[PDB]
Ligand binder design. Structure first.
Ligand SMILES: CC/C(=C(\c1ccc(O)cc1)c1ccc(OCCN(C)C)cc1)c1ccccc1
Ligand SMILES: CC/C(=C(\c1ccc(O)cc1)c1ccc(OCCN(C)C)cc1)c1ccccc1
Ligand SMILES: CC/C(=C(\c1ccc(O)cc1)c1ccc(OCCN(C)C)cc1)c1ccccc1
Ligand SMILES: CC/C(=C(\c1ccc(O)cc1)c1ccc(OCCN(C)C)cc1)c1ccccc1
Ligand SMILES: CC/C(=C(\c1ccc(O)cc1)c1ccc(OCCN(C)C)cc1)c1ccccc1
Ligand SMILES: CC/C(=C(\c1ccc(O)cc1)c1ccc(OCCN(C)C)cc1)c1ccccc1
Ligand SMILES: CC/C(=C(\c1ccc(O)cc1)c1ccc(OCCN(C)C)cc1)c1ccccc1
Ligand SMILES: CC/C(=C(\c1ccc(O)cc1)c1ccc(OCCN(C)C)cc1)c1ccccc1
Ligand SMILES: CCCCCCCCCC(=O)N(CCO)C[C@@H](O)[C@@H](O)[C@@H](O)[C@@H](O)CO
Ligand SMILES: CCCCCCCCCC(=O)N(CCO)C[C@@H](O)[C@@H](O)[C@@H](O)[C@@H](O)CO
Ligand SMILES: CCCCCCCCCC(=O)N(CCO)C[C@@H](O)[C@@H](O)[C@@H](O)[C@@H](O)CO
Ligand SMILES: CCCCCCCCCC(=O)N(CCO)C[C@@H](O)[C@@H](O)[C@@H](O)[C@@H](O)CO
Ligand SMILES: CCCCCCCCCC(=O)N(CCO)C[C@@H](O)[C@@H](O)[C@@H](O)[C@@H](O)CO
Ligand SMILES: CCCCCCCCCC(=O)N(CCO)C[C@@H](O)[C@@H](O)[C@@H](O)[C@@H](O)CO
Ligand SMILES: CCCCCCCCCC(=O)N(CCO)C[C@@H](O)[C@@H](O)[C@@H](O)[C@@H](O)CO
Ligand SMILES: CCCCCCCCCC(=O)N(CCO)C[C@@H](O)[C@@H](O)[C@@H](O)[C@@H](O)CO
Ligand code: NA
Ligand code: NA
Ligand code: NA
Lengths: 271, 271, 271, 271
């Protein structure tokens, strides 16, 4: 229709993005002021209404989009669904789920990612890089589970605060992996009772730090290449051959042209 | 034979892998529940039998493989030998070795690596990357030994808990390398007695952190390329020229084709 | 003019650079000696005059440059403007700004960067690499703000020293991100009152360490390539195609020449 | 001569290298046993003689080399000079230098690097990578000096143990850069007296961690490429074009051959 044609161009305008961005920043700034308990009852009521104002502008924004794109058209984008859920959850009447409350209204500032395209790209590259490190992430999960069971059996009776159960052991092994007081706080005290405890903890540190670095480098290198590759697909409109494919086949492509040159030289030398 | 033909296809089926995977997870989950000492005698006896059930399924699995592939055929794979040793050790009657016990039945969860091919590849790439960092690993071992001897001679009489002997010094130098309370916990106290101790510990930290990072980056970069190269060899069936060789000879290959072009141009300009 | 021709060649001479370098080192060395409060009143007065001498040589240096290049010519370089501001601020009479004093005369040693070209290049590569990581830096800023608001609401009433307000929470979240006593000092004490606090802090650590590593790797890789690319532009005088462009179009360029070879082969086989 | 022909081939034999390697390990193992103060006077005298035996074998080894290569020929290699100095210093009668003693006989184990070629290559690549990071290393040195002077002036009167003088401040800034108790141990106590101290320490941490990572990544990436490039020069005998040069000129080389193809196509289409 005509009403669903200008609205899309209003939605796609730089100023509309900037207006929404300004309202996200504003909502975020009022939620930060609401952390101050010394504020007067009138100041709290004022900011709570600016929060209500900000939220209503997001209901108008999402409705404008659902109409101008359609239910199937809007929910076709993962970013729009995320934007929908962020706003729709604020109007959820006693939602049934394992948690505590929804005071986490500050997760509305996470919309700065979906609304700013330079930031949307960064998060997109990182998210697209996750499936590819699933195996490394699972190997790290296996090492933690094996280690947690071993630590609970070995040290739980003598160190119940740190290794009393599986939960306690996963928490202190995560601390050990982060190298946080691993020796002065955990292993030297454990070695006073179990002198060969270093046989367990030093290999655990060696293995988990390498794996977590592997996981992190893997995510970073992939996210960087995916982003670069997507920017090129956006600029030209043509599909970008991933760099790994270009590098894997560089040898094959060079020898083929070397051979095609030699046969063109053979037909040339004898004419 | 006919009996050693369908069994191989049963062994190679996705559902058989999934059945074994489910039994590994199950065994791992019952071993984790067995860390809880508050459980009733009947609950402990129940889970211990589910452990026996899981173990028997692995004996049937390995036997099925040894028959369908042969002794020489099965033990030709490093992964199958690993799978054999994991299961066979659970039936080892008082094995003679320097240790304590075999309560580490949880190392059976490490079979998730050998049974899941996406995880088998990750560990394979990492293991194939180790011989190549042997020299860096040995340099780190030399620096630790020299440092341990120096620290024992310099500080062992005044700081016996940390440097009293070689073992004690290797342990606290490893802690120092991990930057764990290196200054507030070790070096500021040591400097109160030996004021120039920083001349020993600051260069030691500078050298070992660079070397350990070198070792780790070396493993990660190699494991990533080896995996990528093996996936390409698996996809096409052709041997993949390692990227280092492609990069080292990129210059040579380009100038050769440049020259072959210039000589083809020379025969063309004068015909 | 003739007076603004030899001065430029004096300014561009290796010995003039070395003379200025020697005066920066000298000024830096006297400012370091002036940190010693045990010095006699005559020794303090002596060094304070060597500081005055060093400062005057920089006024002569900058004036020499402004004359030999012109106001528009001198201030056309970001490095010269930096050099101008460093020297000009020492003669600022009670400048109006939010601070405390200008005792930070030691920021004059930062001129070793602008005066030594090998060091000017390093800092240049790093500075040119910053706009490109602005989105990652902003994502990290968003995560910190959301987390600070959450931590203030959740823990500020029970842990006011660490989370009492927004400022306090940003400071302890930065400490948590650096892994400094995150568990023994902050989270184990917080968990004694709020047992599921690990649900907040472990994901926060996981997310911020990956993002800060991403930010850092991004800066390092870019600064390294920018420097390499600028050295090549300086050596040849020709514009250097950035490596990302060379890599993105490597596939396209190889298939195009492959096709141009095949069509040259087609005209050759049938002549 | 004939006597200086077979000795060189004896010196270059795998077994001679292995004999020297075995004597280095042996000397290192006896020096490690000599750290144990509980040993009997006869055991100490025994090991001290095995040290004398090991040292004499190195005097015979070096003399054998100086004769078989010549004074100019032997001292032409940096590795041989290092090997000469390690052995010659053990016979230095009260050498005049600023130190304490030469009990550091364990630095003789550092010969395992010069004697094992796979380890000699690793250290060689690392040493050749140092001149290239000199500017980054100097930038880090400048930041530390500026920071040390600032910290001494700002905090030395109120925190004399940590910032009382320049030496004290460089030591605690190095600790701060390593993130070792930077907040719970240094900055939270400093902020109790100087509440805006975080304005100094948080930027200092941000800047030095990025620079030290830059320095380290720079060394690692260069050492890896230098080693790879030297192995190729050793294998073929031909000079290896450094990868940076191959990558910088990849664009130029591809467009040149693209143009040479188009002109060969132009002469072909009209014959
Ligand atoms: C196209 C980028 C990419 C990868 C890549 C990124 C950067 C780069 O420099 C090279 C490659 C990539 C390649 C392989 C990969 O394997 C994951 C293995 N699974 C089974 C765990 C993951 C990402 C990829 C991402 C998702 C699916 C498939 C491929
Ligand atoms: C050596 C080039 C390379 C890769 C590569 C190797 C051979 C080849 O033919 C093509 C590329 C590389 C790049 C990315 C990569 O991603 C997979 C990571 N997993 C963990 C998701 C693997 C190898 C690389 C490895 C680590 C860091 C940066 C680059
Ligand atoms: C084929 C991959 C590879 C290496 C490699 C991996 C990734 C990459 O981007 C480039 C190369 C490799 C190359 C050299 C190397 O040297 C080790 C030196 N020893 C003597 C300590 C190790 C791995 C390699 C692995 C085992 C043996 C030989 C080579
Ligand atoms: C610069 C490209 C490169 C290597 C390279 C340099 C020159 C060349 O002609 C070919 C490749 C590189 C890659 C891997 C590598 O592995 C050996 C590591 N050892 C420690 C096992 C060495 C250099 C590299 C170095 C560090 C990280 C990622 C990539
Ligand atoms: C030319 C180097 C470069 C980049 C680069 C450096 C090294 C390298 O190996 C590859 C590329 C670069 C490329 C992309 C980039 O995107 C930033 C995204 N913004 C929107 C946050 C940044 C730097 C760049 C720097 C400034 C502006 C534009 C490009
Ligand atoms: C795999 C090669 C690569 C990049 C690359 C991928 C594909 C392509 O066609 C060209 C290059 C790479 C290099 C730099 C880069 O910079 C942007 C970083 N942002 C965060 C500023 C992105 C990808 C790279 C990624 C991480 C570290 C080192 C190298
Ligand atoms: C040939 C390797 C190399 C460099 C290099 C190594 C690996 C790689 O992937 C690319 C290049 C290199 C290049 C530049 C460089 O600049 C140093 C700047 N100085 C002025 C501080 C250093 C090393 C180099 C080493 C010494 C002198 C000159 C060049
Ligand atoms: C993007 C490829 C690259 C470099 C590169 C960029 C452009 C170009 O045309 C050629 C190479 C690279 C490699 C090494 C390097 O060394 C200098 C380091 N200094 C600090 C000694 C610089 C850039 C690189 C950068 C960081 C890590 C690994 C690889
Ligand atoms: C990686 C996922 C790790 C999951 C860890 C287990 C869930 C949380 C456990 C926990 O908080 N407990 C409270 C103990 O204080 C014990 C539970 O069994 C109940 O709450
Ligand atoms: C990838 C690795 C992921 C590790 C995740 C750890 C989750 C387990 C933490 C948890 O739920 N706890 C129960 C809830 O309290 C245990 C910790 O709280 C406990 O270890 C201690 O901190 C103290 O409670 C007891 O001293
Ligand atoms: C990198 C390998 C490091 C090996 C370290 C030496 C072996 C373990 C030493 C040890 O645990 N001791 C017990 C002291 O409590 C001393 C021994 O000599 C006996 O057990
Ligand atoms: C690559 C580097 C590898 C370093 C490996 C260190 C192994 C040595 C540890 C060991 O076997 N110990 C004896 C067994 O107790 C010593 C430690 O336990 C000891 O240093 C202290 O922790 C206390 O026991 C004394 O205060
Ligand atoms: C990333 C930027 C972070 C900015 C943090 C806020 C500014 C500094 C806050 C501060 O130092 N305060 C003193 C409290 O002692 C509170 C202020 O509101 C006044 O000074
Ligand atoms: C990218 C992340 C950037 C984080 C930047 C943090 C700035 C906030 C620090 C600040 O201005 N403070 C007020 C000035 O004191 C707060 C800290 O000082 C406070 O948290 C504590 O250290 C104690 O003062 C109270 O226990
Ligand atoms: C990066 C190089 C850093 C050099 C640091 C200065 C030299 C060592 C200083 C020192 O140990 N002192 C002893 C104070 O206890 C003070 C001296 O002035 C005299 O010894
Ligand atoms: C690239 C960065 C390089 C930093 C190098 C630091 C060298 C300075 C260390 C030194 O020589 N000291 C004098 C010798 O004692 C000072 C330290 O010892 C001192 O800071 C404290 O540790 C205590 O002595 C006082 O509380
Ligand atoms: Na740390
Ligand atoms: Na710590
Ligand atoms: Na730490």
């Amino acid at each position: 229709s005509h009403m669903s044609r200008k609205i899309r161009d209003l939605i796609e305008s730089k100023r509309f993005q900037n207006v929404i961005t300004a309202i996200i920043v504003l909502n975020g700034a009022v939620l930060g002021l609401l952390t101050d308990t010394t504020l007067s009852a009138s100041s709290q009521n004022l900011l709570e209404r600016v929060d209500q104002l900000c939220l209503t502008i997001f209901i108008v924004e999402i409705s404008l989009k659902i109409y101008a794109y359609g239910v199937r058209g809007f929910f076709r984008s993962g970013w729009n669904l995320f934007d929908f859920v962020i706003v729709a959850i604020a109007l959820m009447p006693a939602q049934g789920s394992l948690s505590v409350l929804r005071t986490f209204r500050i997760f509305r500032v996470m919309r700065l990612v979906s609304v700013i395209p330079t930031m949307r790209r960064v998060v997109q590259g990182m998210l697209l890089a996750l499936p590819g490190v699933g195996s490394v992430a699972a190997l790290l999960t296996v090492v933690f589970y094996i280690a947690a069971v071993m630590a609970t059996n070995l040290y739980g009776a003598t160190f119940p605060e740190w290794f009393g159960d599986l939960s306690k052991s996963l928490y202190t092994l995560f601390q050990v992996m982060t190298l946080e007081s691993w020796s002065m706080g955990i292993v030297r005290p454990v070695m006073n009772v179990h002198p060969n405890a270093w046989v367990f903890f030093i290999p655990f540190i060696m293995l988990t730090t390498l794996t977590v670095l592997n996981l992190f480098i893997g995510i970073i290198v992939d996210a960087m290449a995916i982003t670069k590759e997507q920017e090129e697909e956006a600029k030209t409109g043509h599909h970008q051959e991933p760099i790994s494919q270009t590098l894997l086949h560089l040898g094959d492509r060079l020898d083929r042209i070397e051979k095609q040159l030699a046969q063109n030289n053979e037909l040339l030398q004898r004419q």
